[PDB]
Amino acid sequence: MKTRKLTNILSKLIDKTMAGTSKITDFTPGSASRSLLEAVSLEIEQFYILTKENIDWGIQEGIIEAFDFQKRQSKRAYGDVTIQFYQPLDMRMYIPAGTTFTSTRQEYPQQFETLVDYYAEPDSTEIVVEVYCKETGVAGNVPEGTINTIASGSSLIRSVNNEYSFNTGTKEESQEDFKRRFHSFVESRGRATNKSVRYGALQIPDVEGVYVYEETGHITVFAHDRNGNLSDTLKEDIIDALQDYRPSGIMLDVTGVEKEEVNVSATVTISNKSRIGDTLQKHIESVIRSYLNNLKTSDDLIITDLIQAIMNIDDVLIYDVSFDNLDENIIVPPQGIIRAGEIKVELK
Template identity: 40%
Template sequence: MKFKRMTEIYSRLVDSTITNTNEINDFSVGSAMRAIYEAISIELEQFYIITRENIQEAIEAGVYSSFGFTRKQAMKAYGNLQLTFHTANQVDLPIPRGTRFTSSQSAYPQVYETLVDYYIPAGSLTATIQVYCTIPGEVGNVPANVIDVMMTPLANVKSVTNPSAFLTGQDAEPLEEMRSRFRSFIEALSRATIPALEYGTRTVPEVSGVYVDEQTGLITIYAHDRNGDLPENVQNSIETTIQNYRPAGIPVEVKPVIKKALDVSVVVTLTNKSAITNAFRDKISSEIQRY
């Protein structure tokens, strides 16, 4: 299909009119016929633009479909909560699946819940559990120390908080990232290579960073999520997934990274002073941490 611009369409309309009739000959700026033809030309140009975009998207979708390549869906934010008890537990304390938590701050109405049952050993003064936001997407990402309300009260619990920010919530994969990931997918078709191991690790939805260290007789994969951590369930998923990408006969280990905190000072200048709020500062801080 030949793409036609508005000027070309307008010229063809004028030429056809002049050729086939002598009753219309005023196409000066401001004339009725010029306005009508320009409106028609603009609409036809939009038709060509939309048609071309639809064809390109159809071709792209067809290529992805032929390889069984799909777009990543939105993911729920997750992270660790620290519970502090008034006194050491006398017996094992169960925290059932579905126990919910939230924040006392109105800027963070998100709700988080446990997905598995936890049993806190007797004699414990503190405990760490993992919770997931009930809503998928980046909306679940929150700064450190804002989740402080236990919606399902338990005896002897003194306080609850999230020592680190939650940064693992992700919206549906942007098309540009999907295209970039597809290029990595093509490179990974040749198995038992570093690109293949890296891509295979990244197919685990929680993984946001990978480094493959190849040595004689040993391959070590360092991976982390957006929190900079490698939870046990994510590590197990990586170990299972890379079986289809690893070389035979060479051991492959999956390890977490060592996080190093860096001091960063940022000065943000705003023309609208009323926009400077604690929630806005926390948003900037969380974006820098995530990046």
């Protein structure tokens, strides 16, 4: 119900007390009756605020329970780790499965562990193996040069270092993204339409950012995974899922997506001259490259969102950003995706 603040409840209580055949009583400050009235009013305020919060929680929980539409769980962070030996191996070495990679900084005590076997062939001064964060959260998104420890490591190993920050871990699914997917599902209740095909293509957890192009009697769906590829098994699974949702008596076909490479060559102005360093450059390069990935099909290379995304890291530290050639938005075709691209940072 409507929210009632302390002052209104206190005035109403004072007015009821005065009208209630009581002239002796006074409500100056410091009195016991005034303090008790204020306390009761604050309790009623607390009750109304908690009631409103419970109403919101109830609405969310009823929407979750209603239908069979629920949010999906978080993804474990993963990335590449680089091994440096004192000398090239003279014989082939085996790495035991479930080797634990960790760090020594107190800010990131999160562990890592390998899933598959790996073999270090001789005459190789370095080996790279993939690693998965055991904790399910954003803590795995460690900056560059954090994971500097290896368990059950031989003496041959000289240094352990990750060349690039992960920036892949995530928390539980965002309220806004869930809300948007639920809108997609609601608009997709009427089958045989663009939005129905869209939801039927997006409901697979692997696929991300599909597009539909409707030629006469001839649907085409441009679907890709987070890596930008489309394996045959997943393609057939998408086709089978869409079969239920496909409009009857009209052709459907799929053919992945064609990547395109552009070099941004971005330049950034930094307020703090002391904080400038190679580490920050590498972090900016990794952030920009990651922004370039996880982008959906058929959207122009908008620069405003790029600059707002890179300024999101620090509003005060980062002053301004400019570009040399891509100042005009690059219009992408229906079968184009902007995912590759080499980034060179030119600090002023």
